[PDB]
Design a protein around this motif. Structure first.
Motif, short mmCIF file in Angstrom:
data_model
loop_
_atom_site.label_atom_id
_atom_site.label_comp_id
_atom_site.label_asym_id
_atom_site.label_seq_id
_atom_site.Cartn_x
_atom_site.Cartn_y
_atom_site.Cartn_z
N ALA A 285 19.92 -3.21 -1.37
CA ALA A 285 18.85 -2.42 -0.76
C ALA A 285 18.18 -1.55 -1.81
CB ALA A 285 19.40 -1.57 0.38
N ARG A 286 18.98 -0.80 -2.57
CA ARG A 286 18.47 -0.13 -3.76
C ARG A 286 17.82 -1.14 -4.70
NH1 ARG A 286 20.88 4.52 -4.05
NH2 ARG A 286 22.67 5.01 -2.71
N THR A 287 18.39 -2.35 -4.78
CA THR A 287 17.85 -3.37 -5.67
C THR A 287 16.49 -3.87 -5.19
OG1 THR A 287 20.12 -4.02 -6.18
CG2 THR A 287 18.37 -5.53 -6.83
N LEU A 288 16.36 -4.16 -3.90
CA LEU A 288 15.07 -4.58 -3.37
C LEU A 288 14.03 -3.48 -3.52
CD1 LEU A 288 15.88 -6.66 -0.15
CD2 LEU A 288 15.35 -7.43 -2.48
N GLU A 289 14.42 -2.23 -3.31
CA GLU A 289 13.47 -1.13 -3.42
C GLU A 289 13.04 -0.91 -4.87
OE1 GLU A 289 16.12 1.46 -1.52
OE2 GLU A 289 15.23 1.26 0.47
N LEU A 290 13.97 -1.03 -5.82
CA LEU A 290 13.60 -0.94 -7.23
C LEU A 290 12.69 -2.09 -7.64
CD1 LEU A 290 16.98 0.24 -8.79
CD2 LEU A 290 14.86 1.55 -8.63
N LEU A 291 12.96 -3.30 -7.14
CA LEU A 291 12.09 -4.43 -7.41
C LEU A 291 10.69 -4.20 -6.85
CD1 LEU A 291 12.00 -7.46 -8.50
CD2 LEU A 291 12.44 -8.10 -6.12
N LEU A 292 10.60 -3.66 -5.64
CA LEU A 292 9.30 -3.35 -5.06
C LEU A 292 8.57 -2.30 -5.90
CD1 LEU A 292 10.06 -3.18 -1.23
CD2 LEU A 292 8.56 -4.81 -2.36
N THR A 293 9.28 -1.26 -6.33
CA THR A 293 8.65 -0.23 -7.16
C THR A 293 8.14 -0.81 -8.46
OG1 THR A 293 9.78 1.72 -6.26
CG2 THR A 293 9.17 1.75 -8.59
N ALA A 294 8.91 -1.71 -9.08
CA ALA A 294 8.51 -2.30 -10.35
C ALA A 294 7.26 -3.16 -10.23
CB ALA A 294 9.66 -3.13 -10.93
N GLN A 295 6.86 -3.53 -9.02
CA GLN A 295 5.70 -4.38 -8.80
C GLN A 295 4.44 -3.60 -8.44
OE1 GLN A 295 6.05 -8.17 -8.38
NE2 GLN A 295 8.06 -7.96 -9.37
N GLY A 296 4.49 -2.27 -8.49
CA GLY A 296 3.33 -1.45 -8.25
C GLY A 296 3.20 -0.85 -6.87
N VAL A 297 4.23 -0.95 -6.04
CA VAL A 297 4.20 -0.33 -4.71
C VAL A 297 4.64 1.12 -4.85
CG1 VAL A 297 5.20 -0.36 -2.41
CG2 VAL A 297 4.57 -2.50 -3.51
N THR A 298 3.77 2.04 -4.46
CA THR A 298 4.04 3.47 -4.61
C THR A 298 4.77 4.07 -3.41
OG1 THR A 298 1.90 4.14 -3.71
CG2 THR A 298 2.01 3.68 -6.06
N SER A 299 4.93 3.33 -2.33
CA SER A 299 5.61 3.84 -1.15
C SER A 299 5.87 2.70 -0.19
CB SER A 299 4.79 4.94 -0.46
OG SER A 299 5.54 5.60 0.54
N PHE A 300 6.94 2.82 0.59
CA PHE A 300 7.29 1.82 1.59
C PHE A 300 8.08 2.48 2.70
CE2 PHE A 300 9.43 1.38 -2.48
CZ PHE A 300 10.70 1.84 -2.19
N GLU A 301 8.03 1.87 3.88
CA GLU A 301 8.77 2.39 5.02
C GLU A 301 10.26 2.10 4.87
OE1 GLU A 301 7.05 0.84 8.58
OE2 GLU A 301 5.23 2.06 8.39
N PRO A 302 11.12 2.96 5.43
CA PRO A 302 12.57 2.79 5.21
C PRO A 302 13.14 1.48 5.73
CG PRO A 302 12.06 4.99 6.02
CD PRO A 302 10.80 4.20 6.14
#
Lengths: 62, 123, 174, 254, 62, 76, 113, 236
Positions: free
Chosen positions: B7-24
């Motif tokens: 979960a931390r891994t998916l969120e870090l991957l999302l952040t690395a792709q330019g997403v500045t925010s996401f729902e929990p």
């Protein structure tokens, strides 16, 4: 439909170590891909590791 | 607070792709989707059979006949529906062969399609 | 006998009875109340076309035909055939040994209705086919009846409306 | 950027090692395209037998629905493609033909049930039986019930196909199935064609029904109307011999 | 274990992620074109003798 | 079921030393609690305003513009 | 049973769904609200929705009741201490069993590690 | 640098510019079949190669056989093909009683390039070994871009002020190849002699089926085998 079902069924038959095409392979493809059943031509359970993990989670939940 | 891995891994991957925010509740949605896909694929592979790699490949190929016709594939990559490019080229050849419609200056901007194709008498 | 009672006075071939037996076997293998309003509470206190056609045919029947019909009405899969039925249905292969007799009686009740429904639909299909061209029932009529009986109500696919998903279910139990 | 450090250091060392090892992947040569690109640009000679699949007309080319003989002709090359050197069982082609007929019937029934109404009743031998039927309107229901009772009393007779007057009248008003009905039905569901995207895309991308016949049919924008719409109520060089050459070529093409 | 270097390495690795498929993605087209092109290739291979004969050659000036 | 407005919580169990498991935190509740609860607050309706972001190339110091306290001009 | 009579009797057949929810979801789907659409048509749509939900409840209550060896079915993770007293609890397992008949899959993982 | 083609290419311009050069192709047409100048066999009008004839009717380049044209070194003239057409169209069989002693018009036409032809060219180059291949797929777009620059060096970039000017411009820039009408909608005694003939053909293995394109495959295979065996023998 024909040139599609036959393609899938032949490879499935070859998978299980067969040198011939039989009605069972066609039936499996027809029932699992298209929901079609033709009459008149003749189970999974969890193992011990899953049960252990579930027991651990339940013990944590109380 | 506790949080599972991947979960931390998916969120870090999302952040690395330019997403500045996401729902929990995106990470758990993705995890449950992965669970469902794995269960379906291996349940398929069980019937074609110990399970070998050939059975897994055949189950995947069978599933690929009615779903996952997307992605970001490029040159001869099965995205956007999976249609062949030569077929699209010949459809374009058939369409673009007709002359452009003739419009007078007095009907430019005011003429509509035929009665069969407009929303009249719908209330 | 079961076919004869359901209006099939011909002489069906081997293939027709074979396919009918196949369908019945598949169904049998695939196979107050607990969920009543009284169950809402923790305390319990003790309380306190087919028929008309059959009648017309029976009226048209003679004495001997009526006697034959009455005798044939008592056909059964299970009556005095418990061991044969259990071996036929593979009881030990799908369930623990020796289910009670009530289960056997219920299965006997259900198989007869299965056969009756199949025969009555096949006869209509055969008659409609005969009309358009201008003998007993054949396997293709049984196939058409089986295809009809496997269709599900539209309530069971309403959540797939507007999408491109295939409906996948189990074997319907008619 | 000070929160990223905390997020990354909250992962255990095993996960960090696994993530860092991704840098060893040798990028994406995508050489596997080559096969796909090639797809577009003592012993038994099995290729000779396999090449027989293209020597028979397709159903669309001959205008004939596939039967046991055609399916039998199709089976063997497929078996030789997959390495099934003993062929197929004798009873497979009949099974395949039955399955094909069932599939087509299901597709057509699904399409028909979404665009039609007022079908024959269950009075006898005609109708949908225990399958899925159509909708009815109030007037049709009333007349059908009245006529069923009248026939039961013996005052009415069916036609040669076994329809009552109301049923025959309703049937005569229906027409052949067109592409507008197919397009409407495809907006409600897959209709059983989820595995055949080419058919669906062919239907969606084509001309509309009746569009080519009425090429010059137009309405106008009129804000004073009920809906805002007004309905109107070298030898032989080409340039000097192209027509003759076209005549000859048309004769050749026939 | 330096935290800045670890963070930089992890983020750089995650930024360049590119998974590979197990089986290729299919490409769809009508059956008629496939059959027609197969037949044309058979005929042309028969005519050219597998590429050993040039039938399109022109001798002279027309 | 993923459009819920409830917070997402996780509980932790142990399979042994260094073998944690995570599960979603739920709890059985009564129907009286859910049915009788108040509704959230309704936000106001959509609207729009106007103001001068710049005048002849200079931003005025009005409440609608950002403050100078909180990289816009070239310095090459 | 005519449609005209049923629509004229819509005073007595109004469902328990508030009008605001009906308007919100009709607008999301593409139908202007009852100020321009007839109120009776909106009431009919809401009544159909209520009937569908009540069907899905009656099933899954049947499933809960027939359930009263002995391990849970994988793929329906949920719950806590399990409630209290001999009360009937709406669980993920029963809802999944019921809605599988309507063509819906609600399977999840129980643990995440 | 190269000369770009005109906005509308016509047979007159190509036939006048490229006079004195050999034609790209020569085809002879007969009653029921056609062939090429140096071909030994024949093609029937009902065969797959019928497709080529259709191109001859539409004055289009036949991309479906482009590879075969590249192998043979067929010349191109500004992407078009010059084709010459020669036109020659304008008892008691199988009876032992028979006796026996041993008992054109010329046209010239031009076929014009299309977009499918360019797509085919690039696709073929992608799989033609020369880096490995002649063209790397990742460089395809760039290459395409350059080709376009050499085909349309001039464009009409002047703007219009009102709809009348746009109408006039659309009228002025019309192209013959894109000026067709919309297509047409899709549409759907001797008996006794025939019956006697059918009855008399009962239990016939081959003649019954009929009620014929010779390719000489077996003879070509035999010739190939003989050549290979002779070559092998010559080695020893």
């Amino acid at each position: 439909f024909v040139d599609n079902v036959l393609h899938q069924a032949c490879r499935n038959a070859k998978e299980r170590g067969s040198k011939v095409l039989e009605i069972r392979d066609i039936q499996l493809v027809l029932e699992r891909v298209y929901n079609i059943r033709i009459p008149g031509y003749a189970k999974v359970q969890p193992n011990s590791n899953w049960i252990k993990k579930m027991s651990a989670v339940q013990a944590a939940k109380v | 607070s506790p949080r599972p891995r991947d979960a931390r891994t998916l969120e870090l991957l999302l952040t690395a792709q330019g997403v500045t925010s996401f729902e929990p509740r995106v990470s758990q949605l993705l995890l449950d989707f992965a669970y469902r896909h794995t269960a379906a694929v291996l349940s398929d592979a069980l019937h074609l059979s110990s399970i070998t790699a050939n059975a897994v490949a055949l189950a995947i190929s069978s599933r690929l006949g009615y779903q996952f016709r997307g992605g970001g594939g490029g040159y001869y990559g099965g995205g956007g529906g999976g249609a062949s490019k030569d077929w699209m080229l010949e459809l374009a050849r058939e369409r673009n062969k007709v002359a452009l419609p003739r419009v007078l200056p007095s009907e430019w901007g005011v003429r509509l399609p035929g009665e069969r194709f407009v929303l009249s008498g719908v209330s | 006998q079961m076919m004869y009672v359901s209006g099939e006075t011909g002489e069906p071939s081997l293939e027709t009875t074979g396919i009918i037996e196949d369908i019945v076997r598949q169904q049998v293998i695939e196979i107050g109340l607990p969920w009543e309003p009284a169950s809402f509470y923790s305390v319990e206190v003790p309380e306190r076309q087919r028929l008309r056609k059959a009648d017309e045919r029976t009226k048209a029947m003679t004495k001997e035909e009526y006697v034959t019909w009455s005798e044939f009405r008592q056909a059964s899969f299970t009556y005095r055939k418990g061991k044969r039925f259990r071996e036929w249905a593979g009881f030990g292969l799908v369930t623990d040994s020796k289910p009670s007799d009530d289960i056997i009686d219920i299965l006997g009740f259900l198989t007869f209705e299965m056969v009756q429904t199949l025969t009555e639909e096949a006869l209509k299909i055969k008659e409609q086919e005969d009309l358009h061209r201008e003998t007993p029932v054949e396997p293709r009529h049984i196939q058409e009846a089986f295809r009809r009986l496997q269709q599900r109500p539209k309530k069971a696919r309403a959540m797939l409306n507007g999408t491109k998903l295939q409906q996948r279910t189990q074997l319907k139990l008619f | 950027e000070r929160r990223l450090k905390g997020e990354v250091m909250q992962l255990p060392a095993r996960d960090r090692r696994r993530i860092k090892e991704l840098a060893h992947n040798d990028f994406d040569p995508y050489d596997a395209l080559a096969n796909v690109l090639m797809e577009h640009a003592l012993k038994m000679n099995f290729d000779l037998e396999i090449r027989k699949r293209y020597a028979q007309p397709l159903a669309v080319e001959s205008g004939e629905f596939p039967d046991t003989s055609n399916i039998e002709s199709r089976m063997l090359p497929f078996c030789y493609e997959a390495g099934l050197s003993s062929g197929h069982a004798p009873d497979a082609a009949q099974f395949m033909s039955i399955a094909t007929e069932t599939f087509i019937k299901e597709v057509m029934s699904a399409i028909f049930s979404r665009t039609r109404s007022n079908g024959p009743g269950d009075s006898g031998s005609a109708g949908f039986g225990l399958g899925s039927g159509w909708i009815q309107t109030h007037r049709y229901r009333k007349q059908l019930a009245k006529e069923e009772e009248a026939f039961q009393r013996g005052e009415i007779s069916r036609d040669k196909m076994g329809l009552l007057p109301v049923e025959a009248k309703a049937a005569s008003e229906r027409g052949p199935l067109g592409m507008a009905d197919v397009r409407l039905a495809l907006e409600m569901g897959d209709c059983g064609l989820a595995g055949f995207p080419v058919i669906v895309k062919s239907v969606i991308y084509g001309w509309r029904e009746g569009e080519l016949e009425n090429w010059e049919d137009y309405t106008y924008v009129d804000p004073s109307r009920p809906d805002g719409i007004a309905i109107p109520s070298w030898e032989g060089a080409e340039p000097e011999t192209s027509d003759l050459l076209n005549a000859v070529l048309d004769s050749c093409l026939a | 274990v330096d935290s800045d270097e670890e963070t930089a390495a992890v983020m750089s690795a995650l930024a360049n992620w590119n998974p590979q498929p197990v089986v290729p993605q299919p490409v769809f087209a009508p059956l008629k074109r496939q059959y027609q092109l197969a037949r044309l290739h058979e005929q042309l291979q028969a005519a050219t003798n597998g590429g050993r004969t040039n039938i399109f050659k022109v001798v002279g000036f027309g | 079921g993923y459009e819920s407005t409830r917070p997402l919580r996780y509980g932790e169990a142990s399979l042994g030393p260094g073998q944690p498991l995570f599960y979603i935190d739920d709890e059985e509740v009564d129907f009286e609690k859910v049915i009788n609860a108040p509704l959230p607050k309704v936000p106001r309706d959509m609207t729009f305003t106007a103001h001068w972001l710049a005048v002849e190339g200079v931003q005025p110091s009005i409440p609608q513009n950002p403050t100078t306290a909180e990289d816009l001009l070239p310095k090459g | 049973a005519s449609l005209r009579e049923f629509l004229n009797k819509m005073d007595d057949y109004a469902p328990i769904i508030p009008d605001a929810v009906t308007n919100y979801y009709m607008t999301r789907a593409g139908l202007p609200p009852p100020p321009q659409t007839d109120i009776r048509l909106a009431r009919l749509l809401a009544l159909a929705t209520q009937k569908f939900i009540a069907d899905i409840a009656a099933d899954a209550y049947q499933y809960s009741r027939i359930r009263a060896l002995g391990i849970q079915r994988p793929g329906y993770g949920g719950g806590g201490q399990g409630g209290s007293q001999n009360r009937t609890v709406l669980t993920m397992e029963d809802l999944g069993m019921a809605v599988s008949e309507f063509g819906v899959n609600v399977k999840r993982s129980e643990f995440y590690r | 640098t190269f000369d770009a083609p005109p906005y509308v290419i016509t047979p007159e311009y190509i036939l006048k510019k490229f006079a004195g050069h050999p034609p790209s192709l020569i085809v002879h047409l007969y009653q029921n079949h056609f062939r090429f100048d140096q071909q030994e066999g024949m093609f029937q009008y009902k065969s797959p190669m019928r497709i080529f004839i259709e191109h001859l009717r539409n004055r289009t380049v036949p991309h479906e056989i482009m590879e075969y044209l590249i192998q043979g070194g067929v010349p191109f003239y500004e992407g078009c093909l010059i084709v010459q057409v020669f036109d020659h169209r304008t008892t008691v069989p199988f009876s032992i009683h028979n006796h026996n002693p041993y008992i054109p018009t010329v046209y010239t036409v031009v076929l014009m390039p299309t977009a499918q032809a360019l797509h085919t060219d690039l696709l073929l180059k992608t799989v033609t070994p020369r880096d490995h291949m002649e063209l790397d797929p990742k460089n395809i777009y760039e290459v395409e871009a350059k080709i376009l620059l050499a085909t349309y060096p001039k464009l009409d970039l002047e703007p219009t002020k009102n709809a009348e000017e746009t109408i006039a411009k659309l009228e002025k820039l019309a192209h013959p190849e894109h000026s067709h009408k919309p297509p047409e909608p899709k549409v759907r005694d001797e008996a006794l002699a025939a019956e006697q003939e059918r009855y008399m053909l009962t239990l016939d293995e081959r003649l019954s089926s009929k009620l014929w394109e010779p390719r000489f495959e077996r003879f070509k295979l035999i010739e190939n085998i003989k050549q290979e065996h002779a070559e092998k023998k010559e080695q020893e």
